[PDB]
Design a protein around this ligand. Structure first.
Ligand code: 9BW
Lengths: 87, 104, 141
């Protein structure tokens, strides 16, 4: 399977399916197999990756959809990230 | 049933899924394809517990309703350099800042 | 344009809330005006009397966030077969990460304080432009 590496500002290396990372048009542009995110710290990028998994799993599915959880403390940074990444 | 995992060593985190019926050893084969280290140079952990190769992920507590897409379960990973295995080290993620006043 | 048809042919429906939100059902009346109906708590159902060709949509009662019914925006009661009710399965959408973040930020910050947030003006605008049924009726047209 094809993976790509997404690297946080603090140096955490997140390895995810390419297909998953292409959820983001921004990441697609940055690839077109590693991308560095100078403004996205690991406590945000980890959650971004979890969102990819969530979206791929639950898009076009019949099984009941749970709420995607976001702790108050990270919501503002996650919002900024999602706006940059267009996801 | 799919289980959704983060396989973590040092500052490396792999997001992937696997069958509840699949084995620890089979998960090392997955890690091998990604990080290019054979199973015999890997130790996998649930918290502090070393996982046995022949056990299913299910038997080791990774179930579909706890290892969820939006909140995946963590599997610790340690590598053998030369003769002996390093200790299990998982770098924590960064800390969120304080809530801005208007969010309190 | 988007409005219920005055058919007068009864259709019994089960509104089934399979979301974790408090659900506001909204009937579009014969002039296209959204009429709100009693709310449904999370996981609850109601057997209700509607009519063929009537139009309904469903919202989070507290925030007006969009919800899906049988996987789509609008629900139109059809003919009941064998006297069985039509099921309207109300669920969460897969929101974009951005929309979900906006929801959470809106839930923690009083609207007067959106401007005090340290973000680009366009995100302040995104926060202030909260979900609203009128907005979506214009959109859906
Ligand atoms: C109990 C409840 N909880 C959440 S919604 C709900 C509820 C409560 C009451 C009703 C009663 N049904 C109605 O009001 C239906 C629904 C919609 O189709 C409009 N409607 C009508 O009876 C409408 N009547 C007609 O169209 C008659 C000319 C046939 C009027 C009275 C609103 C003009 C339906 C649902």
């Amino acid at each position: 399977m094809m993976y790509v590496k997404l690297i946080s500002s603090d140096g955490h290396e997140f390895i995810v399916k390419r297909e998953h990372a292409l959820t983001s048009g921004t990441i697609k542009a940055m690839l077109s197999n590693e991308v560095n995110f100078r403004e996205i710290p690991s406590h945000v990028l980890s959650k971004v990756c979890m969102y990819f998994t969530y979206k791929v799993r639950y898009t076009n599915s019949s099984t009941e959809i749970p709420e995607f959880p976001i702790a108050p403390e990270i919501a503002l940074e996650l919002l900024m990230a999602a706006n940059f990444l267009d996801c | 049933m799919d289980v959704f995992l983060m396989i973590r060593r040092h500052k490396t985190t792999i997001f992937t899924d696997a069958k509840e019926s699949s084995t620890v050893f089979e998960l090392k084969r997955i890690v091998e394809g990604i990080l290019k280290r054979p199973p015999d140079e890997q130790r996998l952990y649930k918290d502090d517990q070393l996982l046995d190769d022949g056990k299913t992920l299910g038997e080791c507590g990774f179930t579909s309703q706890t290892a969820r897409p939006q909140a995946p379960a963590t599997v610790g990973l340690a590598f053998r350099a030369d003769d002996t295995f390093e200790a299990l080290c998982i770098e924590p993620f960064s800390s969120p800042p304080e809530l801005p006043d208007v969010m309190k | 344009v988007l409005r219920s048809v005055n058919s007068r042919e009864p259709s019994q429906v089960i509104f089934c809330n399979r979301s974790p939100r408090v659900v506001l059902p909204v009937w579009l009346n014969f002039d296209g005006e959204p009429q709100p109906y009693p709310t449904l708590p999370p996981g609850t159902g109601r057997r209700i009397h509607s009519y063929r060709g009537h139009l309904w949509l469903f919202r989070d009662a507290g925030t007006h966030d969009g919800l899906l019914v049988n996987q789509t925006e609008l629900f139109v009661p059809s003919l009941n077969v064998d006297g069985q009710p039509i099921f309207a399965n109300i669920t969460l959408p897969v929101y974009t990460l951005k929309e979900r973040c906006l929801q959470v930020v809106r839930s923690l910050v009083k609207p007067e304080n959106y401007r005090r947030l340290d973000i680009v003006r366009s995100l302040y605008e995104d926060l202030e432009d909260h979900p609203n049924v009128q907005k979506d009726l214009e959109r859906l047209t």
